[PDB]
Design a protein around this ligand. Structure first.
Ligand SMILES: N[C@@H](Cc1cc(I)c(Oc2cc(I)c(O)c(I)c2)c(I)c1)C(=O)O
Ligand SMILES: CCCCCCCCCCCCCC(=O)O
Ligand SMILES: CCCCCCCCCCCCCC(=O)O
Ligand SMILES: CCCCCCCCCCCCCC(=O)O
Ligand SMILES: CCCCCCCCCCCCCC(=O)O
Ligand SMILES: CCCCCCCCCCCCCC(=O)O
Ligand SMILES: CCCCCCCCCCCCCC(=O)O
Ligand SMILES: CCCCCCCCCCCCCC(=O)O
Length: 582
């Protein structure tokens, strides 16, 4: 078209356009105040209006990058505030935009955003719905300059829905609080997965990423042909490369193109893309990204046919290794939506190591004849962990299950910081209550998704302040061995316990008036500290101590004289427990 702005304005709609422009500016000028971004938005919107009325109006012909940069270079304090960035204004596009990208600070130093009280929240929402939402949108956008703008807007509307429904409720807190926590965790998970995918693309290269994509895409679209799946894997890879570089406009267009491509070839890909494809421009991508797996053909052959028997195997493999291997992935992955993607990759890698060390020997057909027998234990390892851990999770509840993990992991890597152990364990705990609820068919994909961020999170922390070569080992290994490596950790035989510390095991009647989340974190913290002092303690010896402690919290949070009870009965507990634990 003659005018890009006019065009975007038209299919985006005034509301969406204003919110995205706001997010876009907040992600670059992370230091400017809200009121100043609001002024920019209005001027840009006003300008956009002009181009809608007359495509040929002054400056309407210029591209989005160009218009964005000139307005960005409009800020008078650019140099005094952003310094180096102001120098970007001296060069011409595309260098200018490229220059701006390099100065976007991923982790700026802004105070943590605190959650105000439900009533001040609900009142602000009522008295001025828009500024309340645009202000937080801004605060969130400046802290996460790389979070895909449209997705951030998508979260904003769910937040609005949560305030509309909950602020009219009798008990606003019972309604609103659990929704905010869910929203928050979900957002944090989306950011981590986004950062994770880009990191992975960097370290392991395109091949590994494409492999992951083939397996992922063939589980969702088991009916699409391999050539279609390859086409999508290609564009999907260009899209992520471009979106990871951080250029919003380029990323958005790449996603829109890919979204429409899929919709126009709907019948040739999946039967579940119906809804997603009749939605507005701004939502297609997101929807398609979250679609459910289509049903498989059920009239599908046996993998063994074309991959084990057929004597044409090494010939087909030598002619195009990656293609053949991709086909293997596609074929194995679309018959197994129940496998985690990394499991599919472990099988693909194993098959690869076999074809290599078998196509270079006498009679191929006999060397690789039993490959499928090596798959069996690879498949069963994760499954066994799911049943085993999910059973235990039912015997105990979420909380007691978390404690079990705490005892198990503290013994594994005693070197790790207590607060880290507690946090990781609690998160592992959730994964249990959020995945064991599904039927066996979806349990593994579930755990993989959740475990991938929890694990990368853990690794990053350890990255900053390393404390164990073993953790570092598991953390710097390939993405397919990460989880198995952590599972293989054994109790630390060399670890030398910490000396007793009265304080660490002293507790006042503070825990009585704390919220469940607080009471637990405190009990769990002492628990990690307990195992660190006496790591050779039995599951029993420990259970006994956690027992005396359990009641102890009752006999003191229910006695007319707290503090005294806690300090009197507390002396007993420590003395007795110390003896039981020799
Ligand atoms: N330690 C945090 C709590 C927290 C627990 C989990 I478990 C978690 O991980 C996921 C992963 C996926 I995938 C999801 O869809 C969701 I929702 C949460 C995240 I992020 C945060 C705190 O209390 O501050
Ligand atoms: C996302 C953009 C919309 C923001 C809506 C306001 C959410 C309440 C802010 C609470 C801080 C986040 C938290 O820690 O729960
Ligand atoms: C469409 C061609 C891409 C398929 C490439 C097949 C590679 C299979 C090996 C598994 C990859 C895991 C990543 C890795 O360990 O390098
Ligand atoms: C300046 C205006 C920003 C334009 C953003 C358009 C985003 C389009 C959504 C595409 C998608 O992700 O499917
Ligand atoms: C995941 C964000 C990228 C959005 C790309 C939309 C294109 C449709 C492919 C969606 C298939 C899901 C595969 C995946 O997890 O990336
Ligand atoms: C607590 C729940 C733990 C989940 C069990 C481990 C399963 C991991 C599947 C991912 C993989 O294939 O490595
Ligand atoms: C520090 C704590 C590291 C513990 C990593 C937990 C890995 C989860 C896989 C489940 C398992 O087999 O234990
Ligand atoms: C040196 C030993 C001192 C004894 C310290 C006791 C700490 C154990 C707290 C564990 C709490 C288990 C949680 C629960 O009661 O449900």
């Amino acid at each position: 078209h003659k005018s890009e702005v006019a065009h975007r304005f038209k299919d985006l709609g005034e509301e969406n356009f204003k919110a995205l422009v706001l997010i876009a500016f907040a992600q670059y000028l992370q230091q400017c105040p809200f009121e100043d971004h609001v002024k920019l938005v209005n001027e840009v919107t006003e300008f956009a209006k002009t181009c809608v009325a007359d495509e040929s109006a002054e400056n309407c012909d210029k591209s989005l990058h160009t218009l964005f940069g000139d307005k960005l270079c409009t800020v008078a304090t650019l140099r005094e505030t952003y310094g180096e960035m102001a120098d970007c204004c001296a060069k011409q596009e595309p260098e200018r935009n490229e220059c701006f990208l390099q100065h976007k600070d991923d982790n700026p130093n802004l105070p943590r955003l605190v959650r105000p009280e439900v009533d001040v929240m609900c009142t602000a929402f009522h008295d001025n719905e828009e500024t309340f939402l645009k202000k937080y949108l801004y605060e969130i956008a400046r802290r996460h300059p790389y979070f895909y703008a449209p997705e951030l807007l998508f979260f904003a509307k769910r937040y609005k829905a949560a305030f509309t429904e909950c602020c009219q409720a009798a008990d606003k807190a019972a309604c609103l609080l659990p929704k905010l926590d869910e929203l928050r965790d979900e957002g944090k998970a989306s950011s981590a997965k986004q950062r994770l995918k880009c990191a992975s693309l960097q370290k392991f290269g395109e091949r590994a990423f494409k492999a992951w994509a083939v397996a992922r895409l063939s589980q969702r679209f088991p009916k699409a042909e391999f050539a279609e799946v390859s086409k999508l894997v290609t564009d999907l890879t260009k899209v992520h490369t471009e979106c990871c570089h951080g250029d919003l406009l380029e990323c958005a267009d790449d996603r829109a193109d890919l979204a429409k491509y899929i919709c126009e070839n709907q019948d040739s890909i999946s039967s579940k893309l119906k809804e997603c494809c009749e939605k507005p421009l701004l939502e297609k991508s997101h929807c398609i990204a979250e679609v459910e797996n289509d049903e498989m053909p059920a009239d599908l052959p046996s993998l063994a046919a074309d991959f084990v028997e057929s004597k044409d195997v090494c010939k087909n493999y030598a002619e195009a290794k990656d293609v053949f291997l991709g086909m293997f992935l596609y074929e194995y992955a679309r018959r197994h939506p129940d496998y985690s993607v990394v499991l599919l990759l472990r099988l693909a890698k194993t098959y690869e190591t076999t074809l290599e060390k078998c196509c270079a020997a006498a009679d191929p057909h006999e060397c690789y004849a039993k490959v499928f027998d090596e798959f069996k234990p690879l498949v069963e390892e994760p499954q066994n962990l799911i049943k085993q851990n999910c059973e235990l999770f039912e015997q105990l509840g979420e909380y007691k299950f978390q404690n079990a993990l705490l005892v198990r992991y503290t013994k594994k890597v005693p070197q790790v910081s207590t607060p880290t152990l507690v946090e990781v364990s609690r998160n592992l705990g959730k994964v249990g209550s959020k995945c064991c609820k599904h039927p066996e068919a979806k349990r593994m994909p579930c755990a993989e998704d959740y475990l991938s961020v929890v694990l990368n999170q853990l690794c990053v922390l350890h990255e900053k302040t390393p404390v164990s070569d073993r953790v570092t080992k598991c953390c710097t290994e390939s993405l397919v061995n990460r989880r198995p490596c952590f599972s293989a950790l054994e109790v630390d035989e060399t670890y030398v316990p910490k000396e007793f510390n009265a304080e660490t095991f002293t507790f006042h009647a503070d825990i009585c008036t704390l919220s469940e989340k607080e009471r637990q974190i405190k009990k769990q913290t002492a628990l990690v500290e307990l195992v660190k002092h006496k790591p050779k303690a039995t599951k029993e010896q420990l259970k006994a101590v956690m027992d005396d402690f359990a009641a102890f919290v009752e006999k003191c949070c229910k006695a007319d004289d707290k503090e005294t009870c806690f300090a009197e009965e507390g002396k007993k507990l420590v003395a007795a427990s110390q003896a039981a634990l020799g």
